Design a protein around this ligand. Sequence first.
Ligand SMILES: [Cl-]
Ligand code: NA
Length: 259
Amino acid sequence: ADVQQKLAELERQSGGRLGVALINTADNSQILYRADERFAMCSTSKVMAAAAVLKKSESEPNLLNQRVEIKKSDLVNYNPIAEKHVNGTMSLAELSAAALQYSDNVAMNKLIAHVGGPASVTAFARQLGDETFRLDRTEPTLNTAIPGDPRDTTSPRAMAQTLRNLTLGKALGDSQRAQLVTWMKGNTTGAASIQAGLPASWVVGDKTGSGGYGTTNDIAVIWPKDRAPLILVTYFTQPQPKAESRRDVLASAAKIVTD
Ligand SMILES: [Cl-]
Ligand code: NA
């Protein structure tokens, strides 16, 4: 309860809307704040697109080696890896890694297309037991994050439970689960978000997201020193369309709920 008051104070101080879900797998306890409200996922949705391709690879073992052409027409707004491979191909494994580790938006679009579009990613979430997740659009429009707009949203509670299934549970086969976790542990974009609020010795696998209205998100699996793992989802959005990102708010929330 003291944690609730501290999160409420942080939310007030920040001027935005904060949603937090922590799962402590030691005792299956939860810390929740606005955990059933919807938030725009932005690039945190890349985890579900990658997982859907991994699940397909359980029945098509050569799938991650399949190659995908990258053309100038594929470029969108943020393409740090794909722009180096124009007029060549990348494998689905390389695209998955680019999406998760560099937040490459071409990679995301190629993963979406492969599995059949946003409704197919959403159908995959339903098969896992997540009835809240919805992916509606492709990159870059899925990041608009308009207040009140349900498109491309989920709730903190649902995303934490689903991330627990994907990374610590049995939603994926052992090889595929290990691959997802390795990719998330190799993320290059998260050091200023949840990880900035945790001790240096803890190990984090995370995926960040940012978008309109100053939306600043991070979802993480956390291995504390000599403890059972944690799942932590921190979603944040602001009232002003051109608000700046606030990664520090996510770091502060992480420190509060892990103290
Ligand atoms: Cl503004
Ligand atoms: Na979700």
